[PDB]
Structure 1
Amino acid sequence: NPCEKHSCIAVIDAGSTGSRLHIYSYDTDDTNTPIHIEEIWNKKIKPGFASIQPNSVTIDAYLTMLLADAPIHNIPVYFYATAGMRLLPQSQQKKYYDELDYWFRQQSQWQLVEAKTITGNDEALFDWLAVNYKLDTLKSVQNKSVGVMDMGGASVQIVFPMPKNAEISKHNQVELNIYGQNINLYVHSFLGLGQTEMSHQFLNSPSCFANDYPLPDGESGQGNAPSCKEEVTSLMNSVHKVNQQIQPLLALNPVNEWYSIGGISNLASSQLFHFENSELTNQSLLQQGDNQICHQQWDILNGQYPDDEYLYQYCLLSSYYYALMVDGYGINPNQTIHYIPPEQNLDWTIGVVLHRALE
């Protein structure tokens, strides 16, 4: 048990599509800031906590499945829900947390410390800390700007360095003090623009599915990624005004290295897409979705790749990633976007280890 020799906490990412339990061990430096953070246990379950019926039977079963086979107990737990919970009013969220609090009070293996919904701005701060902790860019002053994107199921986050600015909402700026260095970040989360929520606006768009895919309305797919991308861009920009919010800020505060986490790592690592060095460009992502999925015959393609439950969505998702990054954020189609390998189980929860405060 590493936790007899190191500090350990458990942090649960209660995401829109599923929850991920992590147990982390760590030591601390002379200011009591964590270092040597190691994941010693992981467990993921589906579906999203905020999608299940909020009654005792259902919540008991879900929590029991998530937690019950961990090799290490008697450790503090931080349960933090994200955009799936944010879709619900406080009073519905309350049903979940009252039931959760009760389940923890009824047992003795886990010590619940916090269980609450964090804002997309909190989540975006944690997204940047987690990635930059793994890149070891936190201990010393960097001479390059690292931006992070988290491609979630219900919201997407963007976060990048930006000097403190009297003209931008205080909620979209964070002054972070860590390892003796002062870091100022712009943060934004776009609720409804995560892959599940976005997709619900395009399921009858023939351009967004392979040829002959059966759309729910009875029409047929007729895929064309640039056309699908244009439809998604309408939601990005005509509805959410992503471009007007984010592009002027990126123009003034350029990002040298972009890192992405969330669903895009899984798409880019699938059998259908081909990228080297765990990185992509939006130009290649759109090309590959267009020709590998959109313009293919659905039943033939589905028969060739039977084991991928996301296959039917790849025309829409490649198009959507491009719409978000290129037409929303203004990122050049030729710019490299690194993505963290899925095997790494990297989500924003490392950020909670390093930084316990919330908005």
Structure 2
Amino acid sequence: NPCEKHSCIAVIDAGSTGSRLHIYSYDTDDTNTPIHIEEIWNKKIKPGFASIQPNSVTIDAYLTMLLADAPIHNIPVYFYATAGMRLLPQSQQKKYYDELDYWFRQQSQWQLVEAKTITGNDEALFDWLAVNYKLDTLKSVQNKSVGVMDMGGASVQIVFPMPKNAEISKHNQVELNIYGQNINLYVHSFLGLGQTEMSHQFLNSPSCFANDYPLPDGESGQGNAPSCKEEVTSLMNSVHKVNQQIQPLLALNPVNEWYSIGGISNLASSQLFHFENSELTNQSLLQQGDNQICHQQWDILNGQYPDDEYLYQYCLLSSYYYALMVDGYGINPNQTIHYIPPEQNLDWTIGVVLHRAL
């Protein structure tokens, strides 16, 4: 039991598609900032917390499933929900938290510290701290600008270094001091642009699905990734103004290396796509989606790859990631995007471990 000799906390990422519990052990440096962070337990359950009926029976079953078999308890718990809960009004979220608070008060194995819905800006902060912690880039001042994207089911986040600016909302800027360094970040979350919510605007777009895929309205798929990408870009830019907001900022604050977490890691590591070195380019991602999915005959392809419940969406998802990164953020189609291997189960929760001490 590592928690007899080190500080441990539990952090639950309560996202739109499920909840992932992590238990972390760590030591602290002489500023009481965590160091030597190790994940000692990880469990994911489905569906998302926001998608269950908020009553005591259902919440008890859900929390028992998430927590009951953890090899360690008697530790502090942070339960932080993200865009799934942000899609609900505060009045509806309150019912979930009232029941969750009651569940924790009615037991003794867990010490609930906080249970709340965090803003997308906070989530973006945690995304950047978690990834940079993992890359070991937090220790000292960097030669390089490191940008992080988190591709979620309901929101997407982007975060990159930017000197503190009196022209940009305080909400979109975070200054931190960590390991004796001062770091100023631009943070942004686009609610509605996560893959599930985005996809609900394009399910009858033939260009977004393999040939003869049965669209819900009775028409047939006729896939073409550049065309599907153009459709998605209207949501990104005509509706959300992603390009107006992000591109002028990146033009002035070049990111040297991009890292992505979230769904893109699963897409890129699937049997349908082929990437080396856990990295992709948008050019290659679009081409692969276009040729390996959009221009294929659906029935034939479906029977060939029966083992992938995302298969049907791959023409759309490859098009959407390109529309987001290239047409939205302005990233060069040939720029390397590193993605964290899905086996790592890397999310923003290390950022919570780190941030409380800053």
TM-score bin, normalised by smaller chain: over 0.9
Q: Aligned runs of 1:293-332 on 2, under 5 Å?
A: 293-332=293-332
Q: Please report how far the alpha carbon of residue 108 of structure 1 lies from its aligned counterpart in structure 2 after TM superposition.
A: 1.2
Asked if the contact 2:208/2:222 (under 8 Å) is kept, the reply is yes
Structure 2: distance between partners of 1:300 and 1:24: 45
**Residue-by-residue CA offset, 1:240-285 (whole Å, 9 max, x unaligned):** 0000000000000000000000000000000000000000000000
**Residue-by-residue CA offset, 1:45-88 (whole Å, 9 max, x unaligned):** 11110011111111111111111111001001000000010011
Structure 1: distance between partners of 2:230 and 2:46: 32
Higher mean displacement: 291-300 or 349-358: 349-358
**Residue-by-residue CA offset, 1:80-106 (whole Å, 9 max, x unaligned):** 000010011111000000000001111
Structure 1: distance between partners of 2:251 and 2:11: 36
Structure 2: distance between partners of 1:32 and 1:165: 29
Q: Secondary structure at the match of 2:217?
A: coil
Gaps of 5+ in 2: none
Counterpart for residue 282 of structure 2: 282
Q: Secondary structure at the match of 1:65?
A: helix
Counterpart for residue 36 of structure 2: 36
Structure 2: distance between partners of 1:108 and 1:42: 21
Structure 2: distance between partners of 1:229 and 1:279: 21
Structure 2: distance between partners of 1:307 and 1:299: 14
Q: Please report how far the alpha carbon of residue 138 of structure 1 lies from its aligned counterpart in structure 2 after TM superposition.
A: 0.4
Q: Aligned runs of 1:160-171 on 2, under 5 Å?
A: 160-171=160-171
Structure 1: distance between partners of 2:108 and 2:247: 50
Structure 2: distance between partners of 1:202 and 1:52: 26
Higher mean displacement: 233-242 or 49-58: 49-58
Structure 2: distance between partners of 1:121 and 1:325: 18
**Residue-by-residue CA offset, 1:167-214 (whole Å, 9 max, x unaligned):** 000000000110110000000000000000000000000000000111
Structure 2: distance between partners of 1:245 and 1:356: 29
**Residue-by-residue CA offset, 1:219-239 (whole Å, 9 max, x unaligned):** 111000000000000000000
Counterpart for residue 59 of structure 1: 59
C-alpha RMSD of the superposition: 0.8
Counterpart for residue 220 of structure 1: 220
**Residue-by-residue CA offset, 1:25-50 (whole Å, 9 max, x unaligned):** 00111111101100000000111100
Asked if the contact 2:127/2:150 (under 8 Å) is kept, the reply is yes
Q: Secondary structure at the match of 1:10?
A: strand
Counterpart for residue 135 of structure 1: 135
Q: Please report how far the alpha carbon of residue 357 of structure 1 lies from its aligned counterpart in structure 2 after TM superposition.
A: 7.8
Q: Secondary structure at the match of 1:126?
A: helix
Change (3 A) 1:148 1:176: same
Asked if the contact 2:33/2:357 (under 8 Å) is kept, the reply is no
Structure 2: distance between partners of 1:170 and 1:282: 31
Asked if the contact 2:34/2:357 (under 8 Å) is kept, the reply is no
Aligned length: 358
Q: Please report how far the alpha carbon of residue 293 of structure 1 lies from its aligned counterpart in structure 2 after TM superposition.
A: 0.3
TM-score by length of 2: 0.99
Higher mean displacement: 48-57 or 8-17: 48-57
Q: Please report how far the alpha carbon of residue 130 of structure 1 lies from its aligned counterpart in structure 2 after TM superposition.
A: 0.2
**Residue-by-residue CA offset, 1:145-188 (whole Å, 9 max, x unaligned):** 00000000000000000000010000000001101100000000
Q: Secondary structure at the match of 2:168?
A: coil
Asked if the contact 2:224/2:294 (under 8 Å) is kept, the reply is yes
Q: Please report how far the alpha carbon of residue 349 of structure 1 lies from its aligned counterpart in structure 2 after TM superposition.
A: 0.2
Q: Aligned runs of 1:84-99 on 2, under 5 Å?
A: 84-99=84-99
Q: Secondary structure at the match of 2:343?
A: helix
Q: Please report how far the alpha carbon of residue 17 of structure 1 lies from its aligned counterpart in structure 2 after TM superposition.
A: 0.5
Asked if the contact 2:214/2:220 (under 8 Å) is kept, the reply is yes
**Residue-by-residue CA offset, 1:114-154 (whole Å, 9 max, x unaligned):** 00000000000000000000001101000100000000000
Structure 1: distance between partners of 2:326 and 2:310: 23
User: Identity over aligned residues, as a percent?
Assistant: 100
**Residue-by-residue CA offset, 1:303-358 (whole Å, 9 max, x unaligned):** 01001111100000000000000000000000000000000110000000000289
Structure 2: distance between partners of 1:215 and 1:182: 51
Structure 1: distance between partners of 2:295 and 2:255: 34
